[PDB]
Amino acid sequence: MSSLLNSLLPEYFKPKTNLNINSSRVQYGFNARIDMQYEDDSGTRKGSRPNAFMSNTVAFIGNYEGIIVDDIPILDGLRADIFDTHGDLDMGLVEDALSKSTMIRRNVPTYTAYASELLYKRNLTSLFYNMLRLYYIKKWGSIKYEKDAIFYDNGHACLLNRQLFPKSRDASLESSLSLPEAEIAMLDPGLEFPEEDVPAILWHGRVSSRATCILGQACSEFAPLAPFSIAHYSPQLTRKLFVNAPAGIEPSSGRYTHEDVKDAITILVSANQAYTDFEAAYLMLAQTLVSPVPRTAEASAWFINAGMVNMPTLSCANGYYPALTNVNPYHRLDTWKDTLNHWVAYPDMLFYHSVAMIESCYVELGNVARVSDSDAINKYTFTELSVQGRPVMNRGIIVDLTLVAMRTGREISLPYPVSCGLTRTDALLQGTEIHVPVVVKDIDMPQYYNAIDKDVIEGQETVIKVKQLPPAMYPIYTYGINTTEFYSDHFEDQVQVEMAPIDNGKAVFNDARKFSKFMSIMRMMGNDVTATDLVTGRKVSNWADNSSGRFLYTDVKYEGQTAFLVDMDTVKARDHCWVSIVDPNGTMNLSYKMTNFRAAMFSRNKPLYMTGGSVRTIATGNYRDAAERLRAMDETLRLKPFKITEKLDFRVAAYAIP
Amino acid sequence: MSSLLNSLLPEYFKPKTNLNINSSRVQYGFNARIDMQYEDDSGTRKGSRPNAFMSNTVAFIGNYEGIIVDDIPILDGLRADIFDTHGDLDMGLVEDALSKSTMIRRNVPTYTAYASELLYKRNLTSLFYNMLRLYYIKKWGSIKYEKDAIFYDNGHACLLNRQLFPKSRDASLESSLSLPEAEIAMLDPGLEFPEEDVPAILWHGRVSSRATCILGQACSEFAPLAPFSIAHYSPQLTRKLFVNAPAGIEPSSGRYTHEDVKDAITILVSANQAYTDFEAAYLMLAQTLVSPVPRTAEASAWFINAGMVNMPTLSCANGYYPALTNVNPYHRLDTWKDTLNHWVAYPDMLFYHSVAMIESCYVELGNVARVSDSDAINKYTFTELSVQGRPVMNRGIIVDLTLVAMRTGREISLPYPVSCGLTRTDALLQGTEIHVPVVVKDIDMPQYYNAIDKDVIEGQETVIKVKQLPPAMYPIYTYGINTTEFYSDHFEDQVQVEMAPIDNGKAVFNDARKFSKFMSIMRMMGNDVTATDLVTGRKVSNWADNSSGRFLYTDVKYEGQTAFLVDMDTVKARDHCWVSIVDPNGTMNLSYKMTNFRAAMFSRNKPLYMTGGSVRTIATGNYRDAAERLRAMDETLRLKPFKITEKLDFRVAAYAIP
Amino acid sequence: MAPIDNGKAVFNDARKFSKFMSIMRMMGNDVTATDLVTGRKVSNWADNSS
């Protein structure tokens, strides 16, 4: 659904068509003007950062594994005559429709008997999904993956690509897959009895030399070398695929460009009348196009074990019954062609729709992981109460759409209760300790991180014990639309730390809430604060991120009693464009204000600019008003004359309109 | 945009068609009559300057470099039916448009897929840019650049063309470039898949033997030997260029006249309907064509670092799909063929439009440089507040047209937000003193200029320091259209200043404004006064520039606060009218009137006379046969002007919204 | 003062120069001005009573 994913984008964000991606890492964000203030009994110290960049790093790598599951049939496409008043295939009108058609008379009785089983095999989501992945593999084919590269680095702990993804050879995305071609046979119209467990599709005119090569590779096993997101492992959809094309199927060309895959999709959707099938495949790919680079070192627990992708079995019986598909189809919603029409016009817009969906999910799974099991709406039972339909199993797209509904605070409506795609809530529901590997840089690591060893020499491979999952992404596109006090994503905020002159700089935060806001605002001001817990004896640093520049309470890496000693004569100025706290006395009052917002994207430590035309909000009415218009100007070549007009020179001629 | 740049010229001046330029340097100015009237405590004196020549100097020498960048598509020339009710390109109607205009309907699905990807990147501005440069290389192909010539010469200091332009030799303009030829192949109709990264253009009848050689050289690399403005380094546009000509193309001749390039441009625009693409290239050349000769030695800091010319990527899909270009083209403005009709009639008029543009930019940057970096409108954030469109980036022409709006004080509007051309604000946007290399002519040079070596000898090559960039040009064409206090370019003005007490033979001027008014009066009377800056200990002189007969405060060459000790005993008498007095007494009143303006141009120390007939006006009205003004003010670029609000400091300038 | 000036301020007026130098001494700051015309020096700390 293009419509619901479009509304997630911010108001200030004005996207263009083309986006020239030339790397496997993008820092999307915005530039804002922060007017910071520090008030005290001595006086006020004002600062101003005119261009403050708040970013979330997003990569094109992520371990996924496809499995073939059984899903509901999508009945949108079949002629409206055979359907009854309630909206189910009234068998008796099917036998009537087949009898009054251009079918062979000896096949009518035997084909009608099979109809009861074969007409309820309508799900082309798996085919469209694979054909969409082939489009983006050939478009962004020049992106590279190095084996010994830095997945994450925060100064203390480092995590390499070798650690998370073993059995991984370095190669380009184009050179990753070597897809073998499945057989594309021609359906004989005079076949005695239809062959079930072999799908048959429709086609307009002649199957081109390149269309054979695309359909051949789409219905085949994906066995990748490099762990890419749009080239993950998928099982063999089918062995053989029939195509009811009276004009013969040309043999396989071998080569094809990304423009030829768009040609193949547009013919397949139009012939089969499968637009709702495409809408399902569009939302599936939106989840599993890009995966987020973790905010903290201990936020890598989400991507340790491979999340399963639920691909519904390829099943289509249109080739055997050409009569039942015509120009008057049955559809539930009137805006059922909107998702395809959006993709054909603006293919590269999927990148923006993808980051909008994963940012919405991973933000909400952040503040869902911090609720006790003894509650009404908890970790296990947040999907059941929200869903008001009848899906087969609460997995895939249902779990991701219900998280988006919680974030935006609106009602998401789909025409069919389809349960296909990636399932994210895997590591959460387990409710056990996860052992993430790490290579150390400094020697004073295991004070900060909950490490397995207490003394570790530099360059050693250690393990961190993560119990509660910290947030993987900070809200950026969904900044101050549905604000919570955990993230504290306000435009205006203030904190009041109360100290007396008798205290020699040392302040104890009994409250946990205002400790979080103090440590966060001090980092905007470019000050390196290092607090020490009095009960346990561990240490926390506000500088625990190089992207957002905020301090969340989950950076403590421990749930206990709150007694944080901060010594305010060991505060060090780290960044540029900073206010100085030289020697405070009395009550401190910190405050900031974010005024304006400008969309910015970075890649390879350089600005990535959006190019091409101005993207519009395509509606169903905007095309069918031109159908209402029809260009009703009678196609008659009316040539109008020009009267020559003489003036002073007479050498040169001058023509007038009347 | 002819009508825009034509408005910048003064109301009294109307230039003739032809101009035989026969040098690399042209003075332009006017011969005005000044009627001064003096009054002080001693008495009254009345005089009259009968003939006074105020002029700038402009040259054909400027170091520039080309970069190929991706910009917006210009959707002008495509048929009106493919566009919907709003100003948006619908792919639903492209499928219909291509379907109705063919008998072979097998190719419609393939044609639509490729067309959707190519239409959002169509731009012929870079091709017309090179074709225009080839026209002027052949026409003015007898201009000599000598390496051991003078660039600036005052009397104390001197800059040679060895400095500012190393890696250069002595050559004529025709001898500078030795262009190779790209392959101009013929597109046979029947080819089904458009070859990627090769543009295809339409043509009228047979491609002439001469037309081949021009298109071949226009696409090739430019590698100059001598630094020339219209022969600057440009990257290779394309390798191949298809031409859908019904009659086959002829082989390349090798030689062509400047007249043959006009025939090539006129055909290429008419066939492709690329009138708005030409308008972009016309404005883009108006910036580059000429460069200023600096007013003082400090104003050479602008032209050290090579400014980047943003040339858009060459792409076009008219040759493949000639159905999309028909007899009813889509245009936003009704005056969309005025710029080509102006150039084809009067080619040599571009010289006057270029001088008008570069003057307006370099005059207003004189004020922007003096703005403090702690206000709403400053050097960093003046373009962003002005623009009211959605370009790719605030670069090239958008920066230049913003400065023209600030000069004239009128709202400038283009149909498409194009960001292509020279960016000047590079030396300005950096907090670093610039090291201008100079030659010592007189032994007393270190007293005047801020030199590194305080002791020098006639012939030594030293370096001078420039912190704040002074004005490179004085207002001549834009004289009195809007008068600032800094320049003081009034027709009628009454200057009042109080003379400081002359103790021994020296008068102390503590205030900054009073000192500016005093030396401004004494210059108009024609008295060469020399003062000593007390803080620095360097000698200032009101006779700094001889060409423009006025005193600017930037001639002091010291940003900050100071007090001046004026030498009243050594007041020389260079130019004496009857008004001219040596001994001022009490409150000095000078009231002057300027009348009888007449434009005059000098080239190689002789008068340069305009030849040919009188320019008759070509211009189209807002409506041809259009009923309702469908505003469509969403995509169109608009540039809002800023008015200078004078304040007490006088050294600092400030902008406000009118 | 403007940021373009690197701390250096010239007092054209005599009245406000006296008040600046006096209030800076209440605040306990040793300022040393230099006259541009003559070339002599003045110090605000020229008394230990008032």
Closest to A266 (Cβ–Cβ): which among B109, B121, B196?
B109
Partnered with residue A56 across adjacent β-strands are A28
Identify the chains in contact with C, defined as 3+ C-beta pairs within 8 A: B
Do the two chains A and C touch, given a threshold of 8 Å on CB pairs and at least 3 pairs? no
Optimal mutation site among B93, B117, B332, interface A, most CBs of chain A within 10 A: B117
For the CA atoms of B505, B509, B510, B511, what is the dihedral angle to 10 degrees?
170
Residues facing B471 on adjacent strands:
none
Query: At a CB cut-off of 8 Å and minimum separation 6, what does B626 contact?
Result: B334
Task: Write the single-letter amino acid at A553.
Answer: Y
Residues of B in contact with A628 (CB under 8 A): none
User: H or E segment at A533?
Assistant: strand A530-533
Phi, psi of B430 (to 5 degrees): -170, 125
Q: CB-based contacts of B270: which residues, under 8 Å, 6+ apart?
A: B204
Contact assignment for B116 to A631 by CB distance below 8 Å: no
Q: Measure the CA angle with vertex A328, ends A327 and A333; round to 5°.
A: 120
A427 contacts A366 by C-beta, under 8 angstroms: no
How far is it, in rounded angstroms, from Cα B264 to Cα B260?
6
List the one residue out of B147, B149, B148, B151 whose CA is nearest residue B159. Answer: B151
Question: A136: closest CA among A304, A215, A19?
Answer: A19
Q: What is the 3-state secondary structure (H, E, C) of A573-633?
A: ECCCCCCCCCCCCCCEEEEEEEEEEEEEEEECCEECCCEEEECCCCCCHHHHHHHHHCCCC
User: What SS3 string covers B106-132?
Assistant: CCHHHHHHHHHHHCCCCECHHHHHHHH
Long-range contacts of A518-524, Cβ-Cβ distance < 8 Å, separation of 24 or more: A518/A566, A518/A590, A519/A551, A520/A488, A520/A550, A520/A551, A521/A36, A521/A493, A521/A495, A521/A590, A521/A591, A521/A592, A522/A571, A522/A590, A523/A549, A523/A550, A523/A551, A524/A34, A524/A36, A524/A49, A524/A52, A524/A549, A524/A592
Encoded tokens for B236: 């290779």
Q: How far apart are CA A303 and CA A288, in angstroms?
A: 13
Strand segments (E) across B530-576: 530-533, 539-541, 564-567, 572-573
Q: Which has the closest alpha carbon to A396: A280, A517, A566, A231?
A: A280
Please report where in the chains the tokens 């008495």 appear, as a residue: B43
In sequence order, the β-bridge partners of residue B549 are: none
Whole-angstrom Cα Rg for chain A: 30
- Bridge partners (DSSP) of residue B67 are B310
What tokens does B123 get? 């731009």
| Whether A50 and B196 lie within 8 Å, measured CB to CB | no
Sheet holding B157-160, edge to edge: B150-153, B157-160, B434-440, B461-466
- Among candidate residues A501, A493, A514, the one with its CA nearest the CA of residue A568: A501
The residue length of chain B stands at 658
Separation CA B239–CA B180 (nearest Å): 11
Residues of chain C in contact with residue B651, where contact means CB-CB under 8 angstroms, are 2, 4
> Which are the contacts of C10, defined by CB distance < 8 A and separation ≥ 6?
B510, B535, B561, B562, B563, C36
Token pair, residue B221, equals 């690399």
Specify whether the CB–CB gap between B318 and B123 falls below 8 A.
no
**Residues A169, A501: Cα–Cα separation, whole Å:** 62
> Helix count (H) and strand count (E) of chain A?
15, 32
By CB atoms closer than 10 A (0-12, 13-18, 19+), residue C48 is exposed
DSSP code at position B501: P
3-state secondary structure B239-287: CECEEECCCCCCCCCCCCCHHHHHHHHHHHHHHHCCHHHHHHHHHHHHH
Q: How far is CA B525 from CA A472, B549, B606, in A?
A: 76, 11, 28
- E strands, B470-568, where? 492-498, 506-509, 527-528, 530-533, 539-541, 564-567
**What is the C-alpha separation between A507 and A590, in angstroms, rounded?**
15
Q: Which amino acid is at B299?
A: A
* Tokens at A351, concatenated: 């990148």
Q: Which two tokens stand for residue A637?
A: 């070549």
Helix axes A209-218, A258-272, angle to 10 degrees: 80
- With beta carbons less than 8 A apart as the criterion, state whether B629 and B532 touch: no
Report the distance separating Cα A200 and Cα A108, nearest Å. 18
Helical (H) or strand (E) element with A527: strand A527-528
> In the numeric block, which tokens belong to residue A510?
């009994």
Query: Which token pair is B520?
Result: 């401004």
β-pairing, A527-528 vs A539-541, is unpaired
Please name the member of B75, B81, B117 whose beta carbon is closest to the beta carbon of A259.
B117
Q: How many CB atoms lie within 10 A of CB B81?
A: 18
Which H helix or E strand runs over A385?
helix A383-386
Radius of gyration in angstroms for the set of CA atoms belonging to chain B, rounded to a whole number? 28
Q: Nearest 5°: phi and psi at A353?
A: -65, -35
Burial of B385 (0-12, 13-18, 19+ CB in 10 A): middle
- For testing the chain B interface, which of A207, A344, A576, A630 should be mutated: the one with the most B CBs within 10 Å? A344
**What letter represents residue B338's amino acid?**
D
Q: Which residues lie closer than 8 Å to A634 by C-beta, 6 or more apart?
A: none
CA distances to A156, A337, A338, A350, A558 from A420, rounded to whole Å, are: 40, 20, 20, 18, 36
Residues on B contacting C at a C-beta cutoff of 8 Å: 372-374, 468, 508, 510-511, 534-535, 559-563, 565, 649, 651-652
Measured distance CA(A253)–CA(B491) in Å, rounded? 79
d(CA B282, CA B275): 11
**Residue in this structure with the two tokens 């949108």, named with its chain if needed:** A76
Radius of gyration over every alpha carbon of chain C, rounded to an integer in angstroms: 12
B218 Cβ partners below 8 Å, 6+ apart? B127, B130, B131, B134, B237
Q: How far is CA B135 from CA A293, B58, B123, B228, B262, in A?
A: 54, 21, 21, 15, 7
Name the 3-class secondary structure at B557: coil
Token look-up 């019904």 returns: B246
Q: Which chain A residue is nearest to residue B108, measuring alpha carbons?
A: A263
Residue of B nearest to C13 (CA): B510
Using an 8 Å Cβ cutoff, are A529 and A517 in contact?
no
Contact of B213 with B250, CB cutoff 8 Å: no
Dihedrals phi, psi of A362, to nearest 5 degrees = -65, -25
Contacts of A440 (CB under 8 A, 6+ apart): A156, A157, A158, A456, A457, A458, A459, A460, A462
Find tokens 């009854």 and name the residue. A84
> Would you say A187 and A319 are in contact if contact means Cβ atoms under 8 Å apart?
yes
DSSP state of A405: H
Give the list of residues 6+ apart from residue A606 with CB closer than 8 angstroms, or none: none
Residue partners of A231: CB distance under 8 A and separation at least 6: A133, A137, A173, A176, A177, A222, A224
- The Cα of C12 is separated from the nearest Cα of chain B by a number of Å equal to 6
User: Apex CA C22: angle with CA C17 and CA C28, to 5°?
Assistant: 130
What phi and psi values does residue B261 have, to the nearest 5 degrees?
-70, -35
Read off the DSSP letter of residue A105: T
| Structure tokens belonging to residue B474 | 């004085």
Give the closest residue to B550 by CA, choosing from B155, B55, B11.
Answer: B55
Instruction: Using CB atoms, pick whichever of C4, C8, C36 lies closest to residue B372.
Output: C4
The token duo for B25 is: 């340097």
Question: Within 10 A of A565 (CB to CB), how many other CB atoms are there?
Answer: 12
Q: What share of chain A is helix, strand, coil (3-state, %, to 5)?
A: 25, 25, 50
Tokens of A278: 């495409």
A657–B625: do the CB atoms touch at under 8 Å?
Answer: yes
Nearest 5°: the CA angle A197, A199, A203 is 170
**CB atoms near residue B111 (< 10 Å):** 22
Spatial distance between the Cα atoms of A566 and B363, rounded to a whole number of angstroms = 56
- Token pair, residue B138, equals 């052949």
Would you put residue A449 in left (φ > 0), alpha (ψ -120 to 50) or beta? beta
> Which of B561, B648, B651 would best serve as a mutation to test chain C binding (most C beta carbons within 10 A)?
B561
Residue in chain B closest to C11 (alpha carbons) equals B510
Write out the H or E segment, with its range, that includes residue B4.
helix B2-7
* A10 φ, ψ (degrees, to nearest 5): -65, 170
Given an 8 Å threshold on Cβ–Cβ distance, is C36 in contact with B534?
yes
Contact C5 B534 (CB under 8 A): no
Q: Looking at chain C, how many residues does it have?
A: 50
Q: Give the separation between CA A428 and CA A373, rounded to whole angstroms.
A: 12
Rounded to whole angstroms, how far apart are CA atoms B312 and B277?
11
Q: How many CB atoms lie within 10 A of CB B509?
A: 22
Take residue A249 and report the two structure tokens written for it: 């199927």
Three-class DSSP category at A25: strand
| Experimental technique | cryo-EM
Long-range contacts at A175-180 (CB < 8 A, ≥ 24 apart): A175/A225, A176/A145, A176/A224, A176/A225, A176/A226, A176/A228, A176/A231, A177/A137, A177/A222, A177/A223, A177/A224, A177/A231, A178/A223, A179/A217, A179/A220, A179/A221, A179/A222, A180/A217, A180/A220, A180/A221
Cβ contact A146:A137 at 8 Å: no
Q: What is the DSSP string of B179-222?
A: ----B--B--TT--SPPTT--EEE-SSS--HHHHHHHHHHHSPB
- Number of helices (H), then strands (E), belonging to chain C: the values are 1, 2
Crossing angle of helices A397-408 and A350-368, in 10° steps, is 80
Residues in chain A whose beta carbon is closer than 8 A to a beta carbon of chain B?
14, 16-18, 20, 50, 204-206, 208, 257, 259-260, 262-263, 266-267, 341, 344-345, 609-614, 616, 622-623, 625-626, 631, 657
